[PDB]
């Protein structure tokens, strides 16, 4: 299938005392593989997947140097943004940054992204051309002109189409036993009577990877959305994901209802009926 590498950075200012909390995480697809937390003891980029542990001291030194530098850039940015928005020094504010690259089934570059937010709202983002900028407001427009003058997009484009994809491919090979393995959802249906007259059927998908999945209900072969509930896909905690969809039905009429499960790990979609 297709693959991605993404890095996520969060900095939160601490007006009362000290410097911002800074947390960075890296993912390949839906697998976290590195982290940095300013509150942690190591003050280093740390491994979070077995397949990255083999990287040598040069790797860990460089990653640490770069991520610590990111944290300082965000610290300064928090100050700059406070000024741009004429805000008090008294409140906590947040900067977030996310970037990454997608490759296709042939592992060739598909798309790149790099976006930045202040207090949870879009601030500035690299457009899909990897040349242009979307600035959400006039502060961001100031930043955009600064970033033009500093050749920021050129550097990001080079990283996104080069280093990003090259190292993604490296990771995919080194962690192939898990990263290139799909875990099909284990599926079953439960039944929960609400009265003599009706019952909830709940269609479960468990222990699947990657997280992308579609669960749908049909009645007599046509999509049903009335009287249904679909929960957000959630992490099991062991690297896999879970989801369920439920429908309320007249008791005795269960066989009219089918749950349909689509997932990359399934050659053909599954159909479940109450047994």
């Amino acid at each position: 299938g297709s693959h991605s590498m993404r890095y996520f950075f969060t900095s939160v200012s601490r007006p009362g005392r000290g410097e911002p909390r800074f947390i960075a995480v890296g993912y390949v697809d839906d697998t976290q593989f590195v982290r940095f937390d300013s509150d942690a003891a190591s003050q280093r980029m740390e491994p979070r997947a077995p397949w990255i542990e083999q990287e040598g001291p040069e790797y860990w030194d460089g990653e640490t140097r770069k991520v610590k530098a990111h944290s300082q850039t965000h610290r300064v940015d928090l100050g700059t943004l406070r000024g741009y928005y004429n805000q008090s020094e008294a409140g906590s504010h947040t900067v977030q940054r996310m970037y990454g690259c997608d490759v296709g089934s042939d592992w060739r570059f598909l798309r790149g992204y790099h976006q930045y937010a202040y207090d949870g709202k879009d601030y500035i983002a690299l457009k899909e051309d990897l040349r242009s900028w979307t600035a959400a407001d006039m502060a961001a427009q100031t930043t955009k002109h600064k970033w033009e003058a500093a050749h920021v997009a050129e550097q990001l484009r080079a990283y996104l189409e080069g280093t990003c994809v090259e190292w993604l491919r490296r990771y995919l090979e080194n962690g192939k036993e898990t990263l290139q393995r799909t875990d099909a959802p284990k599926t079953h249906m439960t039944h929960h009577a609400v009265s003599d007259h009706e019952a909830t059927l709940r269609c479960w998908a468990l222990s699947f990877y990657p997280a992308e999945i579609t669960l749908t209900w049909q009645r007599d072969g046509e999509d049903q959305t009335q009287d249904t509930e679909l929960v957000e896909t959630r992490p099991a905690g062991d690297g896999t994901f879970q989801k369920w969809a439920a429908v309320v039905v007249p008791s005795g009429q269960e066989q009219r209802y089918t749950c349909h499960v689509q997932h990359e790990g399934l050659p053909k979609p599954l159909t479940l009926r109450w047994e």
Partner: peptide, 9 residues
Amino acid sequence: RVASPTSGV
């Protein structure tokens, strides 16, 4: 591999 930090905002 992480990118080098960008210019400040």
